[PDB]
Ligand binder design. Structure first.
Ligand code: ACO
Ligand code: ZN
Length: 187
């Protein structure tokens, strides 16, 4: 062996990999700490937690909380923020186990892109599509159908009174995990 997987941070490190575990560790535990603000925007309750949503109009403490989770997600993986919404899964331990950021696109044209291993589809844009920019769940909580619950809550609530359909959702170019999570839906 010689390499480790941290039991509270999830990273696998070791040189210079441990001097990078410290910085991500500190960024992690400080990011996932959810105190529990008043009048949170719960979309669904669960035995293993619940799903809140934050909007760009919310208090500063909620927004700054989201940018620090976001900034944590990006380093764990390596645009216009006024139109986003962010969903967070919190554990019963008052910790954030899942994050999903989706942009409301007003000017998106359906296109088909040829890709052997660009055609227009309409003269007008689609009325509303939900672009998923970030989908993240903490490694020691993965494979527990909790991103699936963030999509299910995404689609029930990203636009009040309507239930997003496969046509009405896009996403940014995925990772292997994002791909492995997507073929869930394709079919
Ligand atoms: C930003 C972009 O748009 S791409 C960014 C993608 N995010 C990441 O890569 C971060 C690291 N990965 C993760 O956080 C998670 O693996 C996510 C976000 C991809 C999905 O979270 P998960 O909780 O694991 O997904 P969830 O449990 O809800 O459903 C996963 C399903 O995907 C399918 N799947 C198959 N293989 C895998 C795999 N290796 N990993 C994940 N899902 C898989 C399964 O059908 C699985 O359902 P099942 O467990 O009942 O068999
Ligand atoms: Zn650690």
């Amino acid at each position: 062996f010689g390499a480790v997987s941290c039991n509270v941070c999830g990273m696998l490190y070791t040189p210079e990999d441990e001097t990078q575990h410290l910085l991500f560790h500190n960024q992690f535990i400080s990011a996932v700490k959810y105190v529990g603000w008043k009048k949170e925007r719960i979309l669904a309750e669960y035995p293993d937690g619940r799903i809140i949503m934050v909007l760009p109009e919310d208090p500063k403490y909620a927004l700054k909380k989201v940018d620090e989770i976001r900034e944590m997600v990006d380093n764990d993986l390596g645009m216009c923020y006024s139109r986003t919404k962010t969903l967070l899964f919190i554990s019963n331990d008052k910790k954030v186990v899942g994050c999903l950021i989706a942009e409301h696109i007003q000017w998106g044209y359906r296109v088909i892109e040829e890709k052997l291993p660009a055609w227009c589809c309409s003269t007008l844009p689609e009325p509303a599509i939900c672009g998923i920019s970030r989908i993240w769940v903490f490694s020691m909580m993965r494979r527990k159908k909790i991103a699936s619950r963030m999509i299910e809550c995404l689609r029930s609530n990203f636009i009040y009174g309507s239930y997003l359909s496969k046509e009405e959702i896009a996403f940014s170019d995925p990772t292997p995990d994002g791909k492995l999570f997507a073929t869930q839906y394709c079919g």
